[PDB]
Design a protein around this ligand. Structure first.
Ligand SMILES: Nc1ncnc2c1ncn2[C@@H]1O[C@H](COP(=O)(O)OP(=O)(O)O)[C@@H](O)[C@H]1O
Ligand SMILES: Nc1ncnc2c1ncn2[C@@H]1O[C@H](COP(=O)(O)OP(=O)(O)O)[C@@H](O)[C@H]1O
Ligand SMILES: Nc1ncnc2c1ncn2[C@@H]1O[C@H](COP(=O)(O)OP(=O)(O)O)[C@@H](O)[C@H]1O
Ligand SMILES: Nc1ncnc2c1ncn2[C@@H]1O[C@H](COP(=O)(O)OP(=O)(O)O)[C@@H](O)[C@H]1O
Ligand SMILES: [Mg+2]
Ligand SMILES: [Mg+2]
Lengths: 152, 526, 202, 525, 527
């Protein structure tokens, strides 16, 4: 019984042991949202199991690329260095949008975010600050390695 | 005429505080419509249909389905009451008032520069603590007792319009579920919509309404020579026709001789007599099919003393197959002794108001029954039909989950003190929205005194003081008089599946409508 | 009414007219097939790539230097992200699959503090491990039948180990529960024998 | 209002507003329908959009054929539909109780009280009114002179008392010769035919059947005495096979052989009929009538006319049920077991033409158990007066036979029931004391309307009637000729028990539900 | 500034009207039926005038009979339809006296307004009219002076049919009485049921009314398709099937498999049709009348064996031909006819009025059916005489049912006005005023006869009561000239339809009572 409809279930199928998920929500608007959110969650674990490599989420990748590309534009940059320098500022909009939607400090939290990523590239003392992200529930840079914020 | 260089033509854009605080006022508007339809002192609400009909009811589900709204957040609240109507029976009006009150206290925290994800994360922590409180204050029910099950269904129909005929409607709704409780394989099921048909006939009195031990249909006999009163008939259910129809091919017969045309007209009569000889080998009395019966088939069943019914519906054939224990066959030459509906009781073709009705009643152990409703007109008989559907589904929840929650305000106050004592160990920014969920549950004892005209200050101060002690914990609001009576003495008890579905749907309605900060309207689709 | 927050479902239903607007709307549709969750972040980056390049071409800088300058920065960003990863799926084990699942659900309606929806996704992908030739452990996520029903809360979402067919029995005289069943999968209409067009009954 | 915010094109009515809508509309239907209660009521001419005259004063035909668009008037019309569906009369008195149950309750609800307090007094008054109705009913063992006075009461209130003396002999004598030995009388056995022959005061009771179709062959006999009824359901006309076959022939000489052979299966059905006429000793007149529900081709009509067999065609569905009981034969669906046992008998079968429209008459049966009231009204609208009064009178005598007791007449029930609620008014012991008073005053509209339509005073009549009831034990009532209180059980004015029982039940529930309505609104667009 | 009056208690109509009371419903139904009484008052009597009435189909109806006037007038008043349908029932019952219903019931409702506005209400006018109506049916058997019983021949019924003719055809009262006498008496069933359907009127455009005659048989308006138009033997074989062969009913398909079946199929069809036409030529037939179509091969052998073909496309005209020659319509193709043949005297063709007709003229055995061939200058004149002819046929059916007659022309209504007034003076009650007004409704019926003759009706109605001094009972009106000096009606021969007078008083009284019962009118929105 699936709340005034009929639904047929097959248990474990004796050959391959497949899986199916039946979602339960309040109305039909939540069930269409729960289906799209579950399908995007199935695509995350698919790419991790296929390509065994994960990056830290929460703006940790965009903070490290915002400072490495500024040093990359100074080495081999003669006339196209202004486009590489604006490529780093365009990548900073992903941690900038996390501070706007959280109603936190904007020009100080991202400035504190790239302060740890700058010391992880110019001070080779094994600082291990490559996984510094954002804690949007608190408003401070956190370590995404121990917090469990992983993206493919 | 040059076109204007625009983007996203003929659509609207709206964000900010006008959408967060705009969906709250749309939820408060629907909760004020059915606010006078919760207590036992409620009143009916006459509605008008676009077909020309009139729906005069006080049930919270039937009111919101007749309202066409244009607001997008108002369309979400109508689908909430449709979900509560299909899961449980009497779980409708309580969710719309509770979801409007949980969003009423949620609008206060949105003005305090608090993020909506903080209120939802406090709502999900509060939802997990409301389920554990109802399971501690529950009570096991003896489902084998008849007088114990009558007090549960009487508590659900005291709000409705059948509370005046409470001694009759409780015995009808209890016997309807216990007849259709069928179990063939190792799986218990109760189907009170496909097998418990509620038919209404205009005329007579409401006190003469009773649940028949069997089925009934509005069908006359095919021939007047057939019997209209059989003591113990052997009913054979058919699915195919007893006529001669064209095959599923391109058949064409070339007639060159003189004796060929008269032979085909004789082979059409011998084909009908062959399938009529195959159904009389088991010696039946009543032949019931879904398609037409030709007059050549009526002649062979007339001299064999067989009463034939012509055009019984497919849903009525599935209902009589459970009452008489017959098998709906679709081949007259493949009939067996197990396909004969033995054990059927008295069959009588009565007439109720210049129209014949085929009664198949007095069965030994029927697995499907038909509630015969007789009243003044079709207007009030649609009310009793909608109330018996809310009376049979609340008996289905007890037979699948025999636990009772003390209703009438005692359920909401027992959890609101449990959320208050558990909020002392929070010590965070989610402590204050956690307290508002316990204050949002106060709207259910608020409604029981606003409908009867009692005071909401002198009563709620005394009702909140009754739940300060852990011993009693079951004091509710008596909607009949207006004082505070314990629910162990009144007998108002609601099932566990009603109160769990009420709290799970009212929180998740506030979860969906608080994450909405933008609305786009004006685009088309396929 | 469609309540959603995914970058692909919003831009597909939204009507656009500008030719530069259809590029960003079709950019979100490609992220579902290639990756599947990466479909709000691509639209904000690709629009800010045009906002900063507009400030360069207003300084009388030629756009071909901005195009060639973006290719030197895009190929270096893939080079830097492939040499600064932490670890593969051997050290973390099952903790990598749960923590990567909760990051995707945080932007949606199933972002609870618990691990109820996170454990059901990992147990679903790990049960459909379909091997291929040359050592390819494929995980076809389209084989998971995701069904919807307006019922209880989100904590009552069943994880059916098997398959959940969305159909009815039909005739109400069949046993609706069969233990130790033998499934006969077949595709032909079980109706009366109708002759074809070339065959007639004369 | 809240409904105006969600839907701007949705009207609404509030708590004190929706009560004034339902009560003022109930007074609108009360003031119109009170001019036709009883024998002194006035006729109402109802003209539709086409222009036809519907002259009647029954309460069910008045509410349906009235150009009114109101939600309150649609609720009372549905209760009035079931009153004329299962028991006939009691439709005009149904609306007047609802018109007074809402008007007498408005005197208390507007004066501070709650509408639910009045509805609690209606249930306590309905319990005493149901027990008092069982004490005033008179069992008279269903005498045939008692059923005349029952049918005379229901027929006077629909005709000008010159046809009531004629229709009572056509209703009582029709309902007695249908079923015996405690059997439910089926009203489908009485056929109602509309003619135009003589006059409105010429409606007779045919002991057999009157068929509205005649012989379809000019050589058939128009008047047949001592006939044999052969009720058939076969199709004597030419029918083809179900499979599309057609014919194929080579020469023109083989063309005429196929036309002779294609009618062989048709003529085999006709040869079974003409051989049955030779096996019933046809050395006399020995008339034969075949009613034959299905159609007959003119080839078989020419064959049956040469033997002397009258053959009708295209009969009704219930003509194989009424004539089967009247003739005593067996309605056959085939000609494989033809025998003289399935044949009927009638002493006279004749036809008559009224403006190129024949009418077949079958009379002189032994025990028919199926009759036909032959209404011969002059005008088209006068046929609707008699037909709506015959079915009002047939359902009145059908309830008096099924129920074992008879209820008294005009004011012998309603005045005595209202006086019983006054002495039981302090028995409720609560706030519902005024609810029994509103129910007792609402039952007094039946002597008030009958005293108003007759031209007498309204308040001066009700004083003298209640004085003769309080100072005696006889159930006194209203006299529509002198105005003096006269007993209804002695003058021959009776009523049905099921009408007065449903008037206390259908009107009370529909009044307690209307008073508990406070949110009349129109949404759904 | 200016206020208005809204609805009060039951104004719930969506565009409909409502009438209640004596002034809004009862008095307006009287004034509407009063205009229909004044409409047909001019066309009443022998000196009545015609009325050119144009209906919705833009065709002309000119007549003086009030029955066909109301069928073309699209009356929309509901109570006015009650006096129209009451006059239509007079046409269906006896066929004469439809103008009497509009005058008598129009005077009953006119004098009813003089009683409701002076005194007692409709509860005593209805009971007062029904008392005088029952007494009016008791004087009518006492006013019968002659009977249509002795010598039922063409000489005596010519004078008895003059009253129904002269009321619509005043100048042609003598010639139309002889044409209706040679047709009605010739179709007599020898003391049986007289059928009015056995008299047909064939309208032939041409000369005046002096060339009209009655032919013993039937006259059609079709052709022959042959050359056998001169038939003197007249042995008629009637068929209802189409005279073209015998085809099947299901599909019909010729199947050829070899060359012998294709070449012999055309010659085999001609030999099959030749044996069927010659089968009726051996039986002695001369005229073959069919109902359906006729093939070309059927016309080839009809002219070869010299038999005449008659095409009758109408099926009701085919049944009347079987009652003319005494034949039986055969549904099958041509058999050897044993005894179901027809027998006439002369079947020929003639062009009369530039219209080729087929005449089945019976010379010796004249009485089987009759057809009155009318000749007129216009097509509208032939319709008015046909209405006067059909009133003469319906008068002959009245004399078959009841042979009694009452002296008409005003002599009956004055004696009815005198006896009812004697019942009104001896009535000790308040309902005597409606009885005296019932007798004054009979006074207005010879008043309409004097106003159409140009005579002052006050001096006419004064001489009628002066000569009715308890023993005369027969003096009517002499409307042949001014200064009347009115004479007897039995001597002049003005007496017709006692049974017509019996139903006309009963139907007009029940029509006026039915209007007075209407106290409240609820109409709908017309479309
Ligand atoms: N006698 C009573 N005393 C106090 N409360 C009552 C009584 N009867 C019913 N109630 C309350 O009225 C409420 C009616 O809820 P209802 O609208 O029927 O819910 P649903 O819409 O789900 O059916 C119940 O929650 C119950 O607590
Ligand atoms: N716990 C967390 N802490 C910080 N950032 C997070 C957390 N969870 C998710 N995010 C961020 O939210 C973003 C959501 O992106 P999303 O809209 O899902 O992209 P797409 O539209 O491609 O699926 C991610 O880029 C991620 O960096
Ligand atoms: N001859 C009579 N004398 C007195 N009262 C009568 C007489 N006939 C009928 N009545 C009264 O008229 C009332 C209405 O009768 P009727 O019109 O037939 O039923 P309804 O009004 O329900 O259509 C009845 O309640 C009855 O008491
Ligand atoms: N020769 C005559 N002299 C005087 N009056 C005549 C003569 N012939 C006819 N009438 C009068 O003319 C009237 C014609 O009435 P008519 O219109 O035929 O009535 P209906 O319409 O019922 O047929 C008769 O009432 C009769 O009195
Ligand atoms: Mg309830
Ligand atoms: Mg005349």
């Amino acid at each position: 019984r699936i709340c005034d409809d009929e639904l047929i279930l097959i248990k474990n199928t004796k050959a391959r042991t497949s899986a199916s998920i039946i979602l339960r929500g309040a109305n039909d608007f939540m069930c269409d949202e729960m289906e799209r959110s579950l399908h995007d969650a199935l695509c995350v674990v698919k790419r991790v199991l296929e390509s065994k490599s994960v990056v830290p989420g929460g703006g940790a990748v965009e903070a490290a690329l915002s400072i490495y590309l500024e040093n990359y534009a100074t080495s081999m940059g003669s006339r196209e260095q202004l486009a590489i320098a604006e490529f780093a500022r365009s990548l900073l909009v992903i941690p900038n949008t996390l501070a706007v939607n959280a109603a936190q400090d904007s020009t100080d939290l991202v400035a504190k975010l790239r302060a740890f990523h700058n010391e992880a590239q110019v001070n080779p003392e094994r600082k291990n600050l490559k996984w510094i992200g954002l804690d949007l529930s608190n408003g401070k840079p956190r370590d995404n390695k121990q917090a469990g914020v992983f993206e493919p | 005429h040059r076109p204007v260089l625009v983007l996203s033509q003929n659509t609207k854009r709206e964000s900010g505080r006008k959408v967060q605080s705009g969906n709250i006022n749309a939820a408060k508007t629907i909760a004020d419509i059915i606010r006078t339809c919760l207590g036992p002192k409620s009143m009916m609400k006459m509605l008008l249909d676009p077909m020309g009909g009139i729906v005069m009811t006080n049930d919270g589900n039937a009111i919101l389905r007749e309202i066409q709204v244009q607001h997008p957040a108002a369309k979400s609240m109508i689908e909430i009451s449709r979900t509560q109507d299909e899961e449980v029976g009497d779980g409708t009006t309580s969710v719309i008032i509770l979801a409007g009150e949980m969003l009423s206290v949620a609008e206060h925290f949105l003005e305090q520069q608090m993020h909506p994800t903080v209120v939802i994360s406090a709502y999900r922590k509060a939802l997990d603590d409301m389920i554990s409180t109802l399971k501690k204050i529950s009570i096991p029910v003896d489902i084998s007792d008849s007088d114990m099950m009558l007090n549960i269904i009487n508590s659900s129909i005291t709000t409705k319009a059948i509370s005046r005929w409470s001694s009759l409607a409780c015995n009808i709704a209890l016997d309807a579920v216990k007849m259709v409780q069928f179990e063939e394989n190792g799986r218990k099921e109760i189907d009170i919509k496909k097998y418990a048909r509620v038919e209404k006939i205009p005329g007579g009195i409401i006190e003469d309404s009773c649940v028949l031990r069997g089925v009934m249909i509005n069908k006359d006999v095919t021939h007047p020579r057939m019997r209209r009163y059989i003591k113990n008939p052997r009913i054979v259910l058919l699915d195919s026709s007893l006529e001669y129809k064209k095959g599923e091919s391109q058949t064409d017969i070339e007639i060159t001789r003189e004796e060929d045309f008269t032979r085909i007209l004789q082979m059409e009569e011998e084909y009908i007599q062959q399938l009529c000889e195959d159904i009389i080998q088991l010696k039946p009395d009543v032949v019931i099919t879904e398609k037409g019966i030709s007059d050549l088939a009526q002649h062979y069943l007339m001299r064999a003393n067989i009463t034939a019914i012509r055009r019984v519906r497919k849903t009525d054939n599935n209902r009589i197959a459970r009452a008489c224990g017959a098998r709906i066959v679709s081949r007259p030459e493949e009939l067996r002794e197990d396909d004969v509906g033995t054990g059927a009781g008295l069959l009588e073709i009565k007439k109720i108001g210049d129209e014949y009705f085929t009664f198949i009643t007095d069965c030994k152990d029927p697995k499907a029954c038909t509630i015969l409703l007789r009243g003044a007109s079709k207007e009030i008989l649609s009310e009793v039909e909608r109330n018996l559907q809310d009376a049979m589904q609340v008996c289905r929840n007890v037979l699948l989950d025999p636990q009772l929650v003390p209703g009438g305000g005692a359920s909401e106050m027992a959890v609101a003190h449990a959320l208050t004592e558990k909020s002392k160990a929070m010590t965070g920014v989610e402590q204050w929205p956690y307290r508002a969920v316990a204050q949002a549950l106060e709207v259910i004892p608020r409604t029981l005194i606003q409908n009867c005209g009692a005071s909401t200050i002198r009563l709620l101060t005394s009702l909140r003081a009754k739940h300060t002690q852990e011993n009693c914990e079951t004091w509710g609001v008596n909607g009949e008089t207006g004082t505070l009576v314990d629910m162990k003495e009144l007998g108002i008890w609601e099932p566990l599946a009603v109160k769990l579905q009420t709290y799970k749907t009212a929180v998740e309605t506030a979860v969906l409508l608080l994450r909405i900060d933008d609305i786009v309207s004006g685009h088309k689709k396929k | 009414v469609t309540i959603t927050n995914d970058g692909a479902t919003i831009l597909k239903l939204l009507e656009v007219e500008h030719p530069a607007a259809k590029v960003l709307c079709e950019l979100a549709d490609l992220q579902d097939k290639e990756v599947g969750d990466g479909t709000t972040s691509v639209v904000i980056i690709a629009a800010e790539l045009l906002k900063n390049a507009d400030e360069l071409v207003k300084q009388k800088i030629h756009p071909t230097s901005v195009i060639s300058g973006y290719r030197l920065a895009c190929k270096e960003a893939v080079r830097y992200i492939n040499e600064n990863l932490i670890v593969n799926t051997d050290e973390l084990g099952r903790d990598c699959l749960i923590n990567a699942a909760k990051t995707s659900m945080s932007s949606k309606i199933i972002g609870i503090n618990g691990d109820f929806f996170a454990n059901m996704v990992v147990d679903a992908v790990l049960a459909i491990k379909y091997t291929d030739i040359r050592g390819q452990p494929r995980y076809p996520v389209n084989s998971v039948n995701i069904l919807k029903a307006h019922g209880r809360s989100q904590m009552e979402s069943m994880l059916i180990s098997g398959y959940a067919l969305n159909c009815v029995v039909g005739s109400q005289g069949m046993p609706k529960r069969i233990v130790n069943a033998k499934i006969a999968c077949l595709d032909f209409s079980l109706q009366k024998t109708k002759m074809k067009l070339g065959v007639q009954v004369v | 209002a809240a409904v105006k915010t969600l839907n701007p094109k949705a009207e609404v009515a509030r708590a004190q507003a929706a009560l004034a809508v339902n009560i003022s509309a109930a007074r609108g239907l009360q003031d119109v329908l009170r001019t036709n209660l009883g024998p002194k009521g006035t006729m109402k001419m109802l003209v539709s959009g086409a222009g036809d005259i519907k002259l009647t004063k029954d309460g069910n035909v008045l509410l349906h054929e009235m150009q009114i668009q109101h939600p309150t008037a649609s609720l009372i019309a549905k209760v009035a539909t079931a009153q004329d569906d299962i028991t006939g009369d009691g439709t005009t008195s149904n609306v007047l109780i609802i018109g007074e149950l809402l008007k007498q309750a408005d005197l208390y609800i507007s004066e501070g009280l709650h509408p639910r307090i009045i509805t609690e007094g209606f249930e306590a008054a309905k319990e005493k009114a149901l027990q008092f109705l069982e004490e005033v009913k008179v069992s008279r063992e269903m005498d045939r002179e008692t059923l005349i006075d029952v049918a005379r009461t229901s027929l006077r209130t629909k005709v000008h008392a010159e046809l009531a003396d004629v229709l009572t002999e056509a209703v009582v004598d029709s309902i007695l010769a249908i079923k015996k030995q405690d059997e439910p009388i089926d009203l489908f056995m009485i056929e109602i035919m509309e003619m135009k022959h003589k006059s409105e005061t010429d409606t007779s009771l045919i002991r057999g059947l009157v068929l509205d179709h005649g012989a379809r062959h000019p050589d058939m006999k128009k008047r047949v005495e001592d006939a044999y009824i052969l009720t058939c359901n076969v199709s004597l006309e030419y029918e083809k096979t179900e499979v599309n076959s057609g014919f194929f022939y080579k020469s023109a000489e083989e063309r005429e052989k196929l036309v002779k052979a294609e009618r062989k299966f048709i003529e085999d059905r006709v040869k079974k009929i003409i051989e049955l006429k030779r096996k019933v000793c046809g050395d006399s007149d020995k008339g034969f009538v075949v009613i034959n529900q299905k159609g007959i081709d003119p080839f078989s009509l020419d064959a049956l006319s040469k033997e002397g067999i009258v053959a009708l065609r295209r009969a009704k569905r219930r003509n194989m049920e009424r004539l089967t009981l009247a003739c005593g034969g067996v309605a056959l669906n085939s000609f494989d077991d033809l025998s003289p046992d399935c044949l009927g008998h009638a002493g006279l079968v004749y036809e008559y033409t009224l403006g190129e429209e024949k009418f077949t008459f079958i009379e002189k049966c032994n025990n028919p158990r199926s009759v036909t009231l032959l209404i011969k009204g002059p005008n088209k609208h006068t046929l609707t007066q008699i037909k709506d009064a015959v079915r009002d009178g047939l359902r009145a005598v059908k309830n008096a036979i099924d129920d074992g007791c008879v209820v008294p007449g005009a004011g012998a029930v309603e005045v005595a029931m209202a006086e019983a609620l006054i002495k039981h008014k302090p028995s409720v012991k609560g706030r519902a004391q005024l609810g029994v008073q509103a129910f007792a005053d609402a039952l007094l509209i039946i002597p008030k309307v009958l005293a108003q339509n007759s031209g007498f005073d309204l308040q001066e009549t009700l004083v003298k009637i209640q004085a003769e009831h309080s100072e005696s034990g006889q159930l006194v009532g209203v006299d529509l000729n002198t105005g003096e209180p006269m007993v209804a059980a002695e003058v021959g004015v009776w009523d049905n028990y099921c009408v007065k029982k449903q008037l206390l039940h259908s009107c009370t529930v529909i009044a307690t539900n209307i008073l508990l309505v406070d949110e009349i609104m129109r949404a759904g667009m | 500034h200016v206020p208005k009056a809204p609805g009060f208690a039951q104004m719930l109509k969506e565009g409909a009207k409502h009438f209640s009371g004596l002034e809004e419903a009862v008095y307006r139904n009287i004034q509407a039926c009063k205009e229909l009484a004044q409409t047909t008052r001019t066309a009443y009597g022998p000196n009545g005038m015609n009325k050119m009435v144009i209906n919705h189909l833009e065709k002309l109806f000119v007549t003086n009979d009030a029955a066909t006037i109301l069928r073309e007038l699209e009356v929309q008043h509901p109570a006015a339809k009650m006096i129209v349908m009451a006059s239509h029932m007079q046409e269906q019952e006896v066929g004469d006296g439809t103008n009497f219903v509009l005058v008598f019931a129009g005077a009953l409702l006119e004098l009813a307004e003089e009683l409701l506005r002076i005194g007692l209400s409709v509860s005593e006018v209805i009971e007062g009219y029904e008392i005088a109506c029952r007494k009016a049916h008791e004087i009518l058997p006492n006013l019968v002076c002659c009977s249509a019983k002795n010598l039922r021949d063409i000489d005596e019924v010519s004078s008895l049919l003059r009253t129904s003719i002269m009321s619509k055809q005043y100048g042609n009262e003598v010639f139309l009485a002889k044409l209706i006498a040679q047709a009605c008496v010739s179709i007599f069933p020898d003391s049986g049921h007289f059928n009015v359907d056995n008299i047909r009127v064939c309208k032939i455009l041409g000369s005046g009314i002096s060339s009209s005659s009655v032919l013993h048989g039937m006259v059609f308006k079709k052709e022959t398709e042959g050359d056998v138009t001169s038939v003197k033997d007249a042995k008629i074989a009637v068929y209802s099937c189409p005279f073209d062969g015998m085809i099947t009913e299901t599909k019909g398909t010729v199947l050829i498999k070899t060359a012998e079946e294709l070449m012999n199929f055309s010659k085999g069809e001609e030999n099959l049709m030749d044996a069927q036409v010659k089968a009726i030529a051996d039986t002695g037939a001369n005229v073959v009348v069919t109902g359906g179509k006729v093939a070309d091969m059927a016309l080839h052998y009809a002219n070869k064996y010299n038999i005449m073909l008659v095409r009758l496309n109408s099926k009701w005209d085919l049944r009347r031909l079987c009652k003319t020659v005494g034949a039986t319509a055969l549904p099958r193709l041509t058999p050897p006819v044993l005894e179901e043949m027809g027998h006439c005297d002369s079947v020929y063709l003639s062009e009369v009025g530039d219209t080729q007709v087929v005449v089945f003229k019976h010379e010796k055995e004249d009485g089987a059916i009759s057809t009155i061939v009318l000749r007129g200058s216009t097509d509208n004149l032939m319709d008015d005489i046909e209405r006067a002819v059909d009133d003469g046929v319906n008068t002959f059916k009245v004399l078959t049912r009841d042979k009694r007659l009452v002296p008409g022309g005003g002599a009956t209504e004055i004696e009815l006005a005198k006896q009812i007034t004697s019942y009104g003076e001896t009535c000790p009650g308040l309902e005597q005023y409606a009885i005296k007004k019932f007798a004054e409704a009979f006074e207005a019926i010879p008043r309409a006869l004097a106003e159409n003759s140009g005579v002052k009706a006050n001096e006419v109605i004064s001489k009628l009561y002066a000569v009715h001094q308890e023993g005369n009972k027969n003096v009517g009106l002499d409307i042949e000239a001014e200064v009347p000096a009115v004479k007897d009606m039995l001597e002049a021969g003005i007496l017709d339809t006692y049974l017509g007078k019996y139903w006309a008083i009963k139907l007009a009284t029940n029509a006026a009572v039915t209007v007075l019962r209407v106290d409240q009118i609820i109409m709908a929105k017309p479309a």
